[PDB]
């Protein structure tokens, strides 16, 4: 409804377009995370292509080591991307 | 440049339209946070026009106790609001 709320809805929508693909409809496997990062965060994260970088993000986000990133764990990634977007407006 | 990246930039933009108003240009006073919450999140968080409700959210954000919500602290509100918006798409 407000522009902020539309941004919140959009982030949720984008999570879901990747989370539905395989396995649990509401969590991201590593493959789904990889597709999300590659496509949707291509200009935000350095070395986004490199394989090592994705295994390491994935391990960092998977706080309970069940090999899935749930919505709550995914929020840590949004936090990282928000800080960088903030940095980017000033630099 | 991606849709996700635009949403993240849009969130920063909205933080700045309130943070520049008074005192430090890059942090939110309780006054600026009040305005932001009531105008931009009016449909996302329960009963946000009560005085008691605004005060609670400010204190919870201001984690080092310096009377400002800087952008890093503001990311916690974004996290709260994302979880709320996620809960609402399924409920
Ligand atoms: Ca999945
Ligand atoms: Ca997990
Ligand atoms: Ca300010
Ligand atoms: Ca503070
Ligand atoms: Cu969901
Ligand atoms: Cu700023």
Curated annotation (Swiss-Prot), chains A, B:
GO biological process, one term: antimicrobial humoral immune response mediated by antimicrobial peptide
Sequence positions that bind Cu cation: 16, 26, 86, 90
Topology of the protein relative to the lipid bilayer: Peripheral membrane protein
Chain residue ranges for the region called Hinge domain: 38-53
GO CC aspect terms: cytoplasm; cytoskeleton; cytosol; extracellular region; nucleus; plasma membrane; secretory granule lumen
Record domain EF-hand: where: 13-48, 49-84
InterPro entries in the cross-refs: EF-hand-dom_pair, EF_hand_dom, S100/CaBP7/8-like_CS, S100_Ca-bd_sub
Localization of this protein: Secreted; Cytoplasm; Cytoplasm, Cytoskeleton; Cell membrane
Residues involved in Ca(2+) 1 binding: 19, 22, 24, 27, 32
Domain notes: The hinge domain contributes significantly to its chemotactic properties.
Subunit field text: Homodimer. Homooligomer (tetramer or hexamer) in the presence of calcium, zinc and copper ions. Interacts with AGER and both calcium and zinc are essential for the interaction. Interacts with CACYBP in a calcium-dependent manner.
Full protein name: Protein S100-A12
